[PDB]
Design a protein around this nucleic acid. Structure first.
Ligand SMILES: Nc1ncnc2c1ncn2[C@@H]1O[C@H](COP(=O)(O)OP(=O)(O)OC[C@H]2O[C@H](O)[C@H](O)[C@@H]2O)[C@@H](O)[C@H]1O
Length: 209
DNA sequence: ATGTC
């Protein structure tokens, strides 16, 4: 009766469109501790500071800031904080891209990864290395459109897929966007990097608030 | 409904 994970299992990384040039110039997403040439932070600083010191207890270890973060859903709680202007960033959701890949693409590429069953800064989050352990996650919570309550559902919606240090651009399969205007601006940027993969750019308003 | 905790 409880939902299982789709296979392939989508993973989602949100970023401001003002960072896409830097992603294509580096040819990869870089983890926070790898000093990405980001133009626009859409994070909470006070939770960023927790990620900065949160130990990852599975090899290859380090801290959460050593990994490129993905969720297993679009339309994240983080995106709600952005949509509602609760962040220092005041631009709203419209310039926020969903970069899409899959857990299985990462495994087949032989990149080191870990994943969690819930918001990764929580002291009781479980960490996993084996894709069979996707069965440990709560796929009802991950897909829930109303996630404010109950508390367990809220935590488990924010299970993370964590790729150590860097995520190659070549593994991104789709860029989802809010609006035609932002789609067009993404294709203009991609065309400045003709050697790079050009993933399909899809308007998915249902991935936004 | 939901302002990542
Ligand atoms: N090559 C690149 N060039 C430009 N920007 C990049 C690049 N690679 C990564 N970025 C962006 O550089 C940034 C890397 O920061 P991180 O910490 O991983 O992701 P968050 O800031 O979304 O933090 C998630 C927050 O969610 C909750 C807590 O409050 C967390 O702090 C991102 O914008 C990347 O897209």
């Amino acid at each position: 009766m409880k939902r299982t994970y789709p296979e392939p299992t989508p993973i989602y990384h949100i970023t401001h469109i003002d960072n896409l040039k830097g992603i294509l110039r580096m040819g990869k997403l870089l983890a926070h501790n790898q000093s990405p040439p980001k133009q626009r932070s859409i994070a909470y600083a006070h939770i960023q500071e927790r990620r900065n010191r949160a130990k990852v207890p599975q090899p290859p270890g380090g801290v959460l800031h050593d990994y490129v973060p993905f969720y297993f859903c679009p339309r994240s709680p983080m995106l709600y904080a952005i949509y509602s202007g609760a962040t220092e960033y005041q631009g709203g959701q419209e310039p926020i891209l969903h970069l899409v890949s899959s857990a299985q693409a990462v495994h087949k590429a032989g990149l080191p990864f870990v994943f969690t069953d819930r918001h990764g800064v929580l002291s009781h989050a479980r960490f996993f290395r084996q894709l069979e352990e996707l069965a440990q996650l709560d796929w009802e919570a991950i897909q829930a459109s109303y996630w404010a309550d109950p508390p367990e559902l809220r935590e488990k919606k924010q299970a993370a897929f964590l790729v150590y240090k860097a995520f190659p651009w070549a593994l991104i399969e789709e860029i989802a966007v809010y609006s035609q205007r932002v789609g067009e601006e993404v294709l203009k940027i991609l065309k400045q990097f003709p050697e790079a993969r050009r993933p399909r750019v899809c308007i998915r308003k249902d991935w936004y608030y």
